[PDB]
Amino acid sequence: MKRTYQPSKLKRAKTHGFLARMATASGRKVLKLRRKKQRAQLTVSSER
Amino acid sequence: PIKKIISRSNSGIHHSTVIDYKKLLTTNKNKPEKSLLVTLKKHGGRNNQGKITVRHQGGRNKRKYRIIDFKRTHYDNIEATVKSIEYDPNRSCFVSLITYANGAKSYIISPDGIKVGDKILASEHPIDIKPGFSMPLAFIPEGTQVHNIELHPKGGGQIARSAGSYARILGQDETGKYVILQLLSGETRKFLKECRATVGVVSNLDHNLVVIGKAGRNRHRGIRPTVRGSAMNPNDHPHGGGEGRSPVGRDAPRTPWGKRHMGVKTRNMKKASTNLIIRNRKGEQ
Amino acid sequence: SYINKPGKTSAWRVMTVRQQVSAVLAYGKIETTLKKAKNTQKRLDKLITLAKVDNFNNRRQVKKWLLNTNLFDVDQLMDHLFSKVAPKYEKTPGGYSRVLKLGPRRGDATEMAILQLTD
Amino acid sequence: DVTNVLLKPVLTEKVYFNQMGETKKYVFVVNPKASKTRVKLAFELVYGIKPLKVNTLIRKPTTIRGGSRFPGLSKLEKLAVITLPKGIAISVTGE
RNA sequence: AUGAGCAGGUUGAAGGUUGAGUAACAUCAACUGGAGGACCGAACCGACUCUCGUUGAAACGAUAGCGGAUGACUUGUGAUU
RNA sequence: UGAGUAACGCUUGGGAGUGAGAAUCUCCCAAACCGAUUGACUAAGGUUUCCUGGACCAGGGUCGUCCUUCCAGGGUUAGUCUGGACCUAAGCUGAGGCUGAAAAGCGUAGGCGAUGGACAACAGGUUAAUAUUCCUGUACUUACAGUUAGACUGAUGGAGUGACAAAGAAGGUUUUCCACCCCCAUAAUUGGAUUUGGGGAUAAAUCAUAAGGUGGUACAAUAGGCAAAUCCGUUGUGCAUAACAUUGAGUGAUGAUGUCGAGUGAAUGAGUGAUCAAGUAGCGAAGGUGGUAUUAAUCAUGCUUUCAAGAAAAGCUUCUAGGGUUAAUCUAGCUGUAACCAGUACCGAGAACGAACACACGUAGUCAAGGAGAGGAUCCUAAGGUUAGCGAGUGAACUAUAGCCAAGGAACUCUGCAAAUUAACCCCGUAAGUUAGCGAGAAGGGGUGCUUAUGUAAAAGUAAGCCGCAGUGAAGAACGAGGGGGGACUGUUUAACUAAAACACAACUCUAUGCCAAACCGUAAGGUGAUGUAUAUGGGGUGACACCUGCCCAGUGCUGGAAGGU
Ligand SMILES: [Mg+2]
Ligand SMILES: [Mg+2]
Ligand SMILES: [Mg+2]
Ligand SMILES: [Mg+2]
Ligand SMILES: [Mg+2]
Ligand SMILES: [Mg+2]
Ligand SMILES: [Mg+2]
Ligand SMILES: [Mg+2]
Ligand SMILES: [Mg+2]
Ligand SMILES: [Mg+2]
Ligand SMILES: [Mg+2]
Ligand SMILES: [Mg+2]
Ligand SMILES: [Mg+2]
Ligand SMILES: [Mg+2]
Ligand SMILES: [Mg+2]
Ligand SMILES: [Mg+2]
Ligand SMILES: [Mg+2]
Ligand SMILES: [Mg+2]
Ligand SMILES: [Mg+2]
Ligand SMILES: [Mg+2]
Ligand SMILES: [Mg+2]
Ligand SMILES: [Mg+2]
Ligand SMILES: [Mg+2]
Ligand SMILES: [Mg+2]
Ligand SMILES: [Mg+2]
Ligand SMILES: [Mg+2]
Ligand SMILES: [Mg+2]
Ligand SMILES: [Mg+2]
Ligand SMILES: [Mg+2]
Ligand SMILES: [Mg+2]
Ligand SMILES: [Mg+2]
Ligand SMILES: [Mg+2]
Ligand SMILES: [Mg+2]
Ligand SMILES: [Mg+2]
Ligand SMILES: [Mg+2]
Ligand SMILES: [Mg+2]
Ligand SMILES: [Mg+2]
Ligand SMILES: [Mg+2]
Ligand SMILES: [Mg+2]
Ligand SMILES: [Mg+2]
Ligand SMILES: [Mg+2]
Ligand SMILES: [Mg+2]
Ligand SMILES: [Mg+2]
Ligand SMILES: [Mg+2]
Ligand SMILES: [Mg+2]
Ligand SMILES: [Mg+2]
Ligand SMILES: [Mg+2]
Ligand SMILES: [Mg+2]
Ligand SMILES: [Mg+2]
Ligand SMILES: [Mg+2]
Ligand SMILES: [Mg+2]
Ligand SMILES: [Mg+2]
Ligand SMILES: [Mg+2]
Ligand SMILES: [Mg+2]
Ligand SMILES: [Mg+2]
Secondary structure (H helix, E strand, O other): OOOOOOOOHHHHHHHHOHHHHOOOHHHHHHHHHHHHOOOOOOOOOOOO | OEEEOOOOOOOOOOOOEEEOOOOOOOOOOOOOOOOOEEEOOOOOOEOOOOOEOOOOEOOOOOOEEEOEOOOOOOOOOOOEEEEEEEOOOOOOOOEEEEEEOOOOEEEEEOEOOOOOOOEEOEOOOOOOOOOOOEEEOOOOOOOOOEEOEEOOOOOOEEEOOOOOOOEEEOOOOOOOOOEEEEOHHHEEEEEOOOOEEEEOOEOOOOOOOOOOOOHHHHHHHOEOOOOOHHHOOOOOOOOOOOOOOOOOOOOOOOOOOOOOOOOOOOOOOOOOOHHHEEEEOOOEO | OOOOOOOOOHHHHHHHHHHHHHHHHHOOEEEEEHHHHHHHHHHHHHHHHHOOOOOHHHHHHHOOOOOOOOOOOOOHHHHHHHHHHHHHOOOOOOOOEEEEEEEEOOOOOOEEEEEEEOO | OOOOOOOEEOOOHHHHHHOOOOOOEEEEEEOOOOOHHHHHHHHHHHOOOOOOEEEEEEEOOOEEOOOOOOOEEOOOEEEEEEEOOOOOOOOOOOO
16 A cells, blocks of 8 residues: 655655754754754655 | 537536637637736635635636736727637636737727728727727717726726626716716716726626536636535534534524624725715615 | 465365375485375376387376476477386386385474385 | 865776776776866876776665664765776886 | 656547428538547556455555546656745 | 463465575575556655675564575666646735734735647667666757848737537548468377467658548738737628638658568576576578458547537737838748756555554556456456465364255244345247336247358358257356335435434425525625526425415514504
8 A cells, every 4th residue: 555654855854854944943942952862863864 | 609518528517618719710710919918816715825725716727818908098099900819718708819010919899890991990089989989988979888998097997897898988977077888787986087997898798697607617617615614623613513514503694604694785985986986786875 | 364375275285196196207206204105105006007108198188187397398208208207117017116214304293105116 | 286186096897897908997086076177187296108098887875784883874985997008007006 | 837658449429511391590411520637448547346465565655456547647857835 | 360271364385505503595496366456657655674794682473595684785877758937727825005902914016836638750779777868870949150142120019729518420541360471399109190389560850642520711801809910800792512721640761781580599707517607698591462341549629419509828829009111020941059956766555655563454547368248247277476483293172264055945033134046148938017217138938069061251051860868067146026104216425333214316485585685604894696687596395297385463473553551
């Protein structure tokens, strides 16, 4: 069946990318929290 | 006039009717002038926020807007000639590709009764009472049909622009301005002396009698299915809920957003144009 | 339970016998399961006794059983059977083949059997 | 110019297949940020014979030593395939 | 918004041409024309029934039938509420 | 504990070899399924899963010497391909600016944004793994400089083109296909063989010729195209069976003394031999004539009809402006120089993707063989590919899937649920009712095989004869009649228990709305309505078509109203 996640290299980067998060106050706050937790994968940009 | 459609497709029966478009249009082919042709973007009944605002709108076919000269004031004192009566998908009334003496081309709302080769001319002096001639309202004798009436001076035509729409002149006022105009729906208004209008009735007088025969034709025209309020849930509409087919239930019918809307007047009387209205289809003011 | 395997159909059984009998006539030994050797033995003996006259009718009868092998074709197996193998068993009253039991397989524990032409 | 865009020559079966038969093809590894024109200039300033043409390869990094206690990624390589004209064959080692 | 897809086979509308006919219309006959939310039926879309499965092959399917299949159709990519 | 129990998730036999150990690994011969696909090319995604050698801790529902697992090494070559350096659609961002307690929202100029437009390369070969990329052969395009000859050059702006819908049917040329012919191998011990089987090809580019398709052509006046115009538009005149302009599938010649080619087929070396080596290197013949009442591709962004009236910009051509005049620029030719960045492996799915699984599920497009057949339906196979990653027995009860069942034929059951009958083509015949379109493939019947002759371009058919219990002998094809309830109909709906009488629909009616319109999103700006104008828009109710829709204005709701009371 058509499952929920249909992978796309563009949609992912344009929705959860670093530039998408750095365009609104809410995204900057989310990035600040992830830096506080010291997440190695800060955003979906750093896939590898 | 109108012409019937005999489907002879054995899936229901529909006595569909369409405008002839053969004896009313010069060329049956679709050859609009390239210069005055901009494309229309279908909003789909959605505002700038992307939210549905006017329901039951969406799904029409691709159209290209034809620039129409509602003002008809730039090339005054210049004789124009009708070249072709064509079909405009953005208005029920036919549009004529007229050409001016200097070689300029334009589209105007086609008056009824004019044919190819009929001269037109607009200006701000008496001119002549001929069909298509546009002059200010001061010099038009009382009784003649006029369409494309201009509300604001130096503006463009706003009133009586649909197919088969016209208005009658009913004299003047003692003020020295506000010439009386009897419009459709039995409303009497006072239009300023300098306001400009075009004589003649708009073409396509038989747009009332066109009969759609199918859901698909109306869907392709750009109309989405309208769901009645009695079939809704008790949420999203006042007339919802119930156990079976239920009546209105309230004291009066209500809008989806919950106002009475039935028989109540919804005109803002504190408007500068109230004093220019003689009758409102029912009585005075 | 559905979408089951085709299975040991009657057509599959006949084809299995055909393949083993063609191989045992070509090489001379077959290392198979005991229950398959005990069924191929009947067809092997029947083919050998019918191929003792060497007339064209007997060739047509045998050709409904023989299959192509590596060492012989379907036409050279005919020459091998009618000129080399069958003439040897010219006065033997049946029992041209012997089936003997080897040890169990490592992955199945089924009883193997060698089928050979008894000289 | 600075000639830091010629990191290391590489010798494989493919390289030796090309490096015989009249025109020689020498494969080096270069700075991944360098362009073809920079590669030709570097060969000019450090060898002396103008390349006939240059081809470039980008080998993507991949996981190595998978399953080992600490897994590691590869290193980004840009490969350059210089081809000198007919009849000329210079040595990569010895100047 | 921009693209793509619907194997194959039938029915033969409006209209037009010709002839008869009419005082002139109307009407009738032949030919042309190829319309239909037309018909049968694959890909495709959907999910009406029996059986099986219900710690499944599968957090909704399999076999056998079944409805639509030029359209209020199906679908890819991109945007948006 | 259940319990060594259920389960192990669609595919066989044998010979030889390796190995300490083989149903499971390698090779060979068969065998069985796919064959509008399990075949081949790619988009998306996956991210080394690709090739070689080695290993059998772990993973593989068994085993394993083997793996898409692990280790080591290696593998992706572009001026022409897919995208940037070119252009825009929906939409996003958006200096100023508007709006808003703050954060922010809206939005102009600009800038991004393909799923579209413009743009120059084809054929063959080569490695274990790459190939319009490397090699060979033959080409093309865009820049810069020098040079020769000609010409006045003409854009950031104007104009034209670019530029387009759905359906349908005719043509032109190549094809598919048919017949003949050429070439290669074959001549057959099972009864007769006087034959059987296979192949018959060449591209981009250059030159010439082009069936046709599209649209009238020149001259003269001009006040219109943010200035200007010789271009466009407009108005006249002449000639208009044609001319002129543009476009155009195909054909011939080079490209080609090349390449490919059925087949023939080694050496060298490994090995005990066979065999590998390899069916590899190399060699490599013919490489054609006519028809077509059969085929698909192109011309074609061609033509006709219909209404639901069918993208933008870049680019190209042209116009002056503006710049030159003792010059610049452009055109054509020659010589030389240069052509950047990213992707290029492999899978593309009953094992590499989305489903936790080597999961019976799902995933855009392109190529589509033969026989019969309308067909891409159906059966069997071709090119090609796989061995459904637990087997061997037995043929108890019982279960699933199938097949069959004598006499009766719905007696079964809530109900003919399910199953069964019919089924393709051709020839007869076809009622009641009706909105005259339908009902209708109504109902009911008949024929189908093979041979000879006649028929045709081929048929179909016709006449005679023969065989079988049966002749679309197998596969794939509608069971029907009558009465009633509801919905007019085609459609839509509760992803995963309700597909229906429910929703919608064309149609009827009421109501609001004179445009800065009513209604609606927000707090506002702003926006939808609508680049619409009462033949228009929004909301309530009813739901083809035909005939009708009666009484009550007490209460409630709505509209209007003089004064008077609060
Ligand atoms: Mg434009
Ligand atoms: Mg509405
Ligand atoms: Mg409407
Ligand atoms: Mg309900
Ligand atoms: Mg409520
Ligand atoms: Mg209610
Ligand atoms: Mg009730
Ligand atoms: Mg069978
Ligand atoms: Mg590259
Ligand atoms: Mg239909
Ligand atoms: Mg426990
Ligand atoms: Mg236990
Ligand atoms: Mg037990
Ligand atoms: Mg048990
Ligand atoms: Mg068991
Ligand atoms: Mg299995
Ligand atoms: Mg098995
Ligand atoms: Mg098969
Ligand atoms: Mg495949
Ligand atoms: Mg891995
Ligand atoms: Mg491998
Ligand atoms: Mg290995
Ligand atoms: Mg194991
Ligand atoms: Mg090249
Ligand atoms: Mg861009
Ligand atoms: Mg694209
Ligand atoms: Mg490959
Ligand atoms: Mg013989
Ligand atoms: Mg001007
Ligand atoms: Mg590839
Ligand atoms: Mg699948
Ligand atoms: Mg998976
Ligand atoms: Mg499996
Ligand atoms: Mg696909
Ligand atoms: Mg076929
Ligand atoms: Mg099939
Ligand atoms: Mg039977
Ligand atoms: Mg029987
Ligand atoms: Mg019976
Ligand atoms: Mg009976
Ligand atoms: Mg009963
Ligand atoms: Mg009973
Ligand atoms: Mg049934
Ligand atoms: Mg009936
Ligand atoms: Mg009744
Ligand atoms: Mg219904
Ligand atoms: Mg239905
Ligand atoms: Mg459901
Ligand atoms: Mg259901
Ligand atoms: Mg407002
Ligand atoms: Mg608007
Ligand atoms: Mg109703
Ligand atoms: Mg009703
Ligand atoms: Mg009263
Ligand atoms: Mg009141």
